[PDB]
Amino acid sequence: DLRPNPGANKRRKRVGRGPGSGHGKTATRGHKGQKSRSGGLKDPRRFEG
């Protein structure tokens, strides 16, 4: 048993999502596509309306 194949067993999918591309999450990048979508939104937790 050696370093060739001691790999992460059948999980731990370190693959984050990349929303810059021409397919999948794209252009608008992730759930956006409108406005007040830029630096941040006010909360909600407590804050808002």
Place this chain on the structure above:
RNA sequence: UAGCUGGUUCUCCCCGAAAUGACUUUAGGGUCAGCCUCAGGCGCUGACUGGGGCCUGUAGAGCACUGAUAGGGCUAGGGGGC
């Protein structure tokens, strides 16, 4: 700082919206609900349909109520004439 404008880069596969309601110094922004999706759980219930019961005041019609209305009759009131 910018609740505004612009821009956001490889591939294939499955599903697939909304542009409504409530509140908002709210109205091209938001929070909750509605609608989308994924995971786990329940498992014949779901849309649609057959049979039966109850709830209803629209279309149409009607003048019994509330009002409107043409002609005639009968008839207080008022008007003209003896």
